[PDB]
């Protein structure tokens, strides 16, 4: 007789006590990760090897070729991709495209306008030493820098229906030359424009000529644009200069769940349900503290370094009849009885499962990106992202602290219940080696023939 004890030294925490030794305790938090950029349920990610979304979509020559790009679960961009827009410039609404790119899993590269179709403008001489392809001066592959043929730049009347039943991205840009001399060197018309238009687009773009600092050895800029061309919708380009024309579209094949991970790691031959920028998780427990911007069926982030359930006892417990926490007994947690003890171990799997079911409503952190002139919104996003994880890690800690408090109280209570069941059956304060399975058999089966043991009561009334 005696509640179970063990020298486990696996401490837990409750509200009233921050360190409580427990015989059997289960961790419910992943501190560990593969440290490898891993597959997501079999689908290989689009790992931009030292390259950017704008570089891939515009087709930077310094980047990987990316010919016939397959499906991807998620895109991996570095924090500072070295192969950015090679020819310097902005990318108009880059982050909206990246958010919109986070809702897709596959493209099909389709050819809007052939390079051969520029019968009146030079498609091939639109090259730059800032974008060298295999040593030779080159340009973005998917968009054609046009230059005048024979000191004349006729207006570019071009139109493309999205005859394809699926949606389409159409990329182009505007050149911003340093001076009017550089304008005249490339485009015979001094005042130029790019008047693009769709069913839901209207924009004219004069080039902003200005003296600028050198970036990648070139001071002229190149601001690129993107538009979602719906099916059965035409995009009509109309420019007499500075037109970085589209050569390839990007047909959206399947719209699904994805994200642009800001991860610096390299590929490892993996397969994992979950992925994190710092690695991958391979366990069913509900929490992790690696990095909140995960993808896949994953534990839900809490920024706690230490989060353990109490599935065991705290070490009257030591008062009178019971000897104490006798370590010798092994079978059973409370009184070596299958009625009370076997049900207790069955609830261990339910308790960890309850937190999975209960804290499934956690805030799923989403990867949003904002540019240098949207610092307020980014700080608003960061504090909203951090704030909810601050709320939910408090709820996880409070829930675990509460459940650790209840379960030790559950263990504290049912020991008193068995002691109460022992105490009420005996009906005597007599404590009562040699009488094994004569004194003890009546206790454990629950049947105590106290009138039959009234000789002890006669010895009780004799001895007092």
């Amino acid at each position: 007789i005696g509640y179970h004890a063990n020298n486990s030294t696996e401490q837990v925490d409750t509200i009233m006590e921050k360190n409580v030794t427990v015989t059997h305790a289960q961790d419910i938090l992943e501190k560990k990760h593969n440290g490898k950029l891993c597959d997501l349920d079999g689908v290989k990610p689009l790992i931009l090897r030292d390259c950017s979304v704008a570089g891939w979509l515009l087709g930077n020559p310094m980047c990987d070729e990316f010919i016939n790009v397959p499906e991807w679960s998620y895109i991996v961009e570095k924090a500072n991709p070295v192969n950015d827009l090679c020819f310097p410039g902005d990318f108009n609404d880059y982050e909206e495209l990246k958010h919109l790119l986070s809702r897709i899993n596959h493209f099909e590269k389709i050819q809007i306008i052939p390079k051969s179709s520029w019968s009146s403008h030079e498609a091939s001489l639109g090259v730059s030493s800032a974008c060298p392809y295999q040593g030779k001066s080159s340009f973005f592959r998917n968009v054609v820098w046009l230059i005048k043929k024979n000191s004349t730049y006729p207006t570019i009347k071009r139109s493309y229906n999205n005859t394809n039943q699926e949606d389409l991205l159409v990329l182009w840009g505007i050149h911003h030359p340093n001076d009017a001399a550089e304008q005249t060197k490339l485009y015979q018309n001094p005042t130029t424009y790019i008047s693009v238009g769709t069913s839901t687009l209207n924009q004219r773009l004069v080039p902003r000529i200005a003296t600028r600092s050198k970036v990648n050895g070139q001071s002229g800029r190149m601001e690129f644009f993107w538009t979602i061309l719906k099916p059965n919708d035409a995009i009509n380009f109309e420019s007499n200069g500075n037109f970085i024309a589209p050569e390839y579209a990007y047909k959206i094949v399947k719209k699904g769940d994805s994200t642009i991970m800001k991860s610096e790691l390299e590929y490892g031959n993996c397969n994992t349900k979950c992925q994190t920028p710092m690695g991958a998780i391979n366990s069913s427990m509900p929490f992790h503290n690696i990095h909140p911007l995960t993808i896949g069926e994953c534990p839900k982030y809490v920024k706690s370094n230490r989060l353990v359930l109490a599935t065991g006892l705290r070490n009257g417990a030591i008062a009178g009849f019971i000897e104490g926490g006798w370590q010798g007994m092994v079978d059973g947690w409370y009184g070596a009885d299958k009625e009370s003890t076997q049900k207790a171990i069955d609830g261990v799997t339910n308790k960890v499962n309850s937190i999975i079911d209960k804290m499934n409503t956690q805030f799923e952190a989403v990867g949003r990106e904002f540019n240098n002139l949207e610092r307020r919104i980014e700080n608003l996003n960061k504090k909203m992202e951090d704030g909810f994880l601050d709320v939910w890690t408090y709820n996880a800690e409070l829930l675990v602290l509460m459940e650790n408090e209840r379960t030790l109280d559950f263990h504290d209570s049912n020991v008193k219940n068995l002691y109460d069941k022992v105490r009420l059956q005996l009906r005597d304060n007599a404590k009562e080696h040699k009488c094994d399975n004569e004194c003890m058999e009546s206790v454990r089966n629950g049947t105590y023939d106290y009138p039959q043991y009234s000789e002890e009561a006669r010895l009780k009334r004799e001895e007092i």
Partner: antibody, heavy 120, light 114 residues
């Protein structure tokens, strides 16, 4: 030495259920992933389903999802492929295929195959 | 979905000369993060199971005759037989494993003795 003997094929009605069984021998069954590949008469190979070593990643073909349920017993060294609501298109020799690499799914050793037929 | 297509469906190669079986892919099974062409090559005689020949599009499985040799990259791939034998009369299937949730085999090329 390395072998994958299949069993459980035979006559099936439309809509009937069938369970295949691929006994494994001559290799560590609980370290190499397993795959199911069907081949109808007069047609090419078609991958049916898949399961990893720890039964933690399972995949099905698009025509097979919601109808089959692959499983394995590592202790028994056997692989199973339940079938439910079978159409006439699954008249095929269901081959039992082992992928050596845990992630890469090139199929090294193949079984004899059981000619499942789904007809009146 | 990712679907493979083989240009020759019934190759007519006499004994002792070269046989080439092209297998295009809808999407490039190359993966630049390891530079490995996720492709397999199989061999199926009539009334026998498939036999893997070339995996990773170049690496040859143990026990395969040396006359087999895969090549190619990205979408286009080739299975080269240096000199056909009577035992090489079989239906040859190419199978990507870039997309693990959807492994798709090729249509199949059967080499016949001319």
């Amino acid at each position: 030495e390395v072998q994958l003997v299949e069993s459980g094929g035979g006559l099936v009605k439309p809509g009937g259920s069938l369970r295949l069984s691929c006994a494994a021998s001559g290799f560590t069954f609980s370290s190499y992933s397993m795959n199911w590949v069907r081949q109808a008469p007069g047609k090419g190979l078609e991958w049916v389903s898949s399961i990893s070593s720890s039964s933690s990643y399972i995949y099905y073909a698009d025509s097979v999802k919601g109808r089959f349920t692959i499983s394995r017993d590592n202790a028994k060294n056997s692989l199973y492929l339940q079938m439910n609501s079978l159409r006439a298109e699954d008249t095929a020799v269901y081959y039992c295929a082992r992928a050596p690499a845990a992630i890469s799914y090139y199929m090294d050793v193949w079984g004899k195959g059981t000619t499942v037929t789904v007809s009146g | 979905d990712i679907v493979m297509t083989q240009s020759p469906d019934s190759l007519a190669v006499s004994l002792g000369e070269r046989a080439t079986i092209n297998c295009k892919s809808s999407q490039s099974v190359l993966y630049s993060s390891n530079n490995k062409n996720y492709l397999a090559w199989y061999q199926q005689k009539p009334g026998q199971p498939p036999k893997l020949l070339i995996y990773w599009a170049s690496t040859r499985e143990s026990g395969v005759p040396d006359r087999f040799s895969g090549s190619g990259s990205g979408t286009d791939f080739t299975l080269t037989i240096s000199s056909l034998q009577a035992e090489d009369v079989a239906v040859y299937y190419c199978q990507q494993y870039y997309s693990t949730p959807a492994l798709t085999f090729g249509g199949g090329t059967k080499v016949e003795i001319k």
